[PDB]
Design a protein around this ligand. Structure first.
Ligand SMILES: *[C]C1=C([C])[C]=C2C(=[C]1)N([C][C]([O])[C]([O])[C]([O])[C]OP([O])(=O)OP([O])(=O)O[C][C]1O[C](N3[C]=NC4=C3N=[C]N=C4[N])[C]([O])[C]1[O])C1=NC(=O)[N]C(=O)C1=N2C#C[C]N([C])[C]C1=[C][C]=C([C]N2N=NC3=C2N=[C]N=C3SC2=NC3=[C][C]=[C][C]=C3O2)[C]=[C]1
Ligand code: C15
Ligand code: C15
Lengths: 495, 498
């Protein structure tokens, strides 16, 4: 067997961040990666037509200090996603340009309803501990309903219900009726709330990495060298002996003092355990699916939308549109002009039956309508990735919790199993679901092992992160009217 | 490599029924079983204190003609679960003895609400094709709500809502808020409806096998000899070459023309596939958990409850009760007196924290109260099994579908993947979730391979089953009043109009 201090299962950002921290502390680490590549739910494709493109995770922004610090240490830079010109909200077949993070509403009843919906998501979040959502005072009540039931209760207008539905679908690549309300409310709150999660400027979509996010995982593989084993899917972990035995599909055996599991929780199912997992983890890993998305990038000769004072952001209501949300994916140099869109949740499942060229025509005709431009019908290139097809991801962006699961099983996600510690973005407490959460979780799991070895004290397991100097956060603000305007039933109780 | 015609992955009833049919048809089969035993979600424990006891699937009944026929051919016999004396409904800390499959309701409004709840479950069921529930006219609407939401809409009384909650928990070892309404309505209708699924006499719980249900899988292993490979968990299936390659954890390689997957759908995740599964199956197998249950059998010197004119059936409402449902588990000879109970859904997770002795004490204290009998505090023996802990089951009794899954993914549950065909009870169209469904699915998968091989015509893939001559099925009937009494809102509409 190949002997080491710690085996890390999975070479995404979380496992690479964990392996780098342990390597830097002087331990002998091995990363066992199932694929022929690192990066996992990040994947940067290079070719002459695109230069580089993120086909998985891409965006970073203020308050994501860990991924920013790790990337800066690896020699990466960010650039700002284009938000200079107007955003578009496409409603009932017409484009309404706007500025600021939130699409405006003009009907007074619809305004109260929209204002109350976002506000209420944040008010509910204030009662949900980031590190223990199952401790919310109404945890059971909120876990036992879907987001569809909560939206049906809160939204008195169809307008608000449709945009809230889009918000859920875009944030978690899942239908409102698939997900727990408690989990979804946790998810938003642990990203800093509604404004922070939805915003480009001053939010999660503010920036991308120059040359692609795949460079984070690639550059840690560059540091670790032949400590990273590609095409080594882990099939078996045996904790019955002095040292932990980890076996791969290609028959190799690794012996370590400890293991970090840095794979999506459900993909623990692909490992046979000796002894069997404890009951709660055995069932948890069958209850935690990942969402469904196709990430699609259409390339053009020029970022022609900018000539019409559009930035390239589109928020597109309704069932017919294949893509509900786009961003400008043009390089910072103004070349490789492109629109990124996501095909979300059931539409990913529905439109996967088409060919690549059929999806390209649907997207170009949608963009031509919404941008009001025939230039959208003249793509020069197309790239796409359907993450539903990935054996070693299960989906994207992240794991969602159906009703009832977070309260019954959530405590088990990061609980160690003997000498296995659990990383992966799903185990983070800030920007779980993101590259930021991957770094937080990988470094925390690594420090749990340094503590088990008696190398650091308990109080160093969870470490704060200084704010990025390059990507400072500005405060989230509200107006007096946003805070105090009544809900629709509130306006009615006054009548 | 060990070469054969068909590798069956899984030696539960479904895989063993598939392997037997293929063996009988003259093919070379191998069964690769992860555990050191066959039977899977069936397990008959033998010791001197119990003689035998089913700790997994046990009950069979009228309309389950495939399991009855298979067991009869293997030399097995059934006996009737004791339902001679009165049943008990325990609610708000008091016991109400009754006769018939349904606890009686005296309050007229509550009676309308109860009658309408069961009626409406079956009315909705008749809209749902057994072989394609996603084709129901309102499939999307029904799949996008939980059973909790459906009970909140239909039940105008708390009495009906509490009994309906117990019914869901007991039928599918899951909470009402965990499961799709479409999937639950399908599950009940594909068992023959509410009456058939809930009944002991004339329903699913009528009978057990003499000597235990594990004998089905064990007697098929006897017929197959060394073709059953125990402690061979399958890790890898490669379909890139002319013959399918199946690898086991203990390093062995099997080469076959076709594979039957006879494991619970999500346990397909334990297999690495080359090439990768198609997208829809790749995601489906992460979306389909199994339920949570501890099966607990408390033994007594005598079946003392019968002397109080109680048969041993208890329907126990209330969060404090660890067990919501019991049956008499006394042997047909009248000895090894015992009460079987289920610890359901969240209670299986909550009470797993206790010791075996702590669970025994809580069960005896509950039974003493429900039966009004101090003798219940004097157990002579105890056996239990928490199926949530089983790596190679995932839970019991069966796979449930959370909201939104059955319409989006259900079509691929038994869709072949190249030369992999899908057995397992979850793929049945009649008594899916049961030993009966396991036989249906195993034999149907085996016949899909016989058809692929040109040995049988397409119309022989799905085969009807003659009715058992030993276990006659009485029809499910309703009264005029059951059919035509209004719902509570129906009554309020008639009041508004008057
Ligand atoms: C895929 C993906 C995609 C496609 C995308 C994305 C993503 C993804 N993401 C994620 C990431 O990527 C993740 O997290 C990470 O990566 C993870 O990591 P980890 O943990 O490490 O993991 P992985 O990678 O997986 O790894 C693992 C590994 O392992 C391995 N394996 C397995 N198994 C195994 C193995 N090995 C060995 N062995 C075995 N067995 C594998 O292979 C691997 O490698 C992301 N992230 C980040 O960060 N970023 C990004 O970008 C991302 N992405 C996405 C994102 C998205 N988003 C955020 C969302 C959104 C968007 C937008 C928005 C906006 N909005 N919304 N809504 C709205 C808006 N706007 C405006 N408006 C609206 S509405 C409204 N209205 C109103 C009014 C008034 C007021 C208010 C309002 O509102 C949002 C969101
Ligand atoms: C009207 N809707 C929004 C459908 C329900 C109000 C919910 S509630 O009446 O506030 O419970
Ligand atoms: C008047 C309010 C009573 C609500 C009764 N429940 C049964 C809660 C809802 C009936 C739903 S529906 O009204 O039949 O759609």
């Amino acid at each position: 067997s190949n002997k080491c201090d710690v085996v890390v299962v999975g070479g995404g950002i979380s496992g690479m961040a964990a392996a780098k921290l342990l390597h830097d502390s002087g331990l002998n680490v091995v990363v066992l990666e199932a694929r022929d590549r690192v990066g996992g739910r990040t994947y940067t494709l290079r070719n002459q037509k695109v230069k580089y493109v993120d086909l998985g995770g891409s965006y970073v922004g203020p308050t994501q200090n860990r991924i920013l610090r790790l990337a800066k240490e690896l020699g990466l830079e960010t650039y700002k996603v284009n938000e200079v010109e107007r955003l578009i909200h496409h409603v009932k077949g017409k484009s309404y340009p706007f500025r600021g993070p939130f699409p405006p509403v003009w009907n007074p009843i619809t305004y109260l309803d929209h204002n109350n919906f976002w506000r209420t998501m944040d008010d509910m979040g204030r009662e949900i501990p980031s590190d223990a959502p199952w401790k919310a005072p109404l945890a059971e009540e909120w876990d036992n309903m879907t987001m569809k039931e909560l939206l049906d209760k809160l939204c008195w207008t169809e307008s608000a219900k449709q945009l809230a539905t889009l918000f859920v679908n875009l944030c978690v690549t899942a239908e409102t009726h698939e997900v727990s309300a408690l989990w979804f409310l946790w998810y938003v709150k642990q990203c800093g709330g509604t404004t922070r999660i939805i915003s480009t400027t001053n939010g999660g979509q503010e920036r991308k990495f120059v040359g692609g996010s795949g460079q984070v995982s690639e550059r840690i593989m560059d540091l670790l060298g032949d400590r990273v084993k590609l095409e080594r899917p882990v099939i078996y972990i045996d904790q019955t002996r002095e040292n932990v035995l980890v076996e791969t599909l290609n028959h190799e055996m690794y012996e370590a003092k400890y293991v970090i599991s840095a794979i999506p929780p459900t993909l623990g199912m692909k490992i046979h355990f000796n002894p069997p997992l404890p009951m709660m983890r055995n069932q948890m890993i069958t209850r935690v699916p990942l969402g469904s998305v196709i990430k699609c990038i259409v390339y053009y000769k020029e970022p022609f939308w900018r000539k019409k004072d559009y930035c390239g952001t589109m928020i597109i209501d309704g069932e017919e549109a294949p893509v509900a949300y786009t961003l400008d994916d043009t390089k910072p140099e103004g070349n490789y002009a492109a629109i990124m869109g996501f095909i979300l949740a059931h539409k990913a499942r529905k439109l996967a039956r088409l060919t690549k060229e059929e999806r390209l025509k649907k997207l170009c005709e949608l963009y031509a309508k919404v941008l009001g431009s025939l230039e959208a019908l003249e793509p020069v290139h197309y790239e796409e990735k359907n993450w539903c097809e990935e054996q070693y991801s299960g989906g994207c962006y992240t794991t969602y919790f159906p009703p009832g699961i977070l309260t019954q099983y959530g405590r088990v996600l990061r609980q160690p199993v003997d000498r296995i510690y659990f990383a992966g973005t799903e185990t983070a407490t800030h920007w779980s679901g993101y590259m930021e959460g991957a770094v937080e979780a990988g470094e925390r799991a690594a420090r749990e092992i340094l503590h088990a070895m008696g190398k650091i004290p308990e109080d160093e397991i969870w470490q704060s992160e200084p704010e990025s100097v390059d990507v400072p956060a500005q405060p989230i603000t509200t107006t007096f009217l946003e805070r105090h305007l009544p809900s629709v039933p509130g306006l009615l109780r006054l009548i």
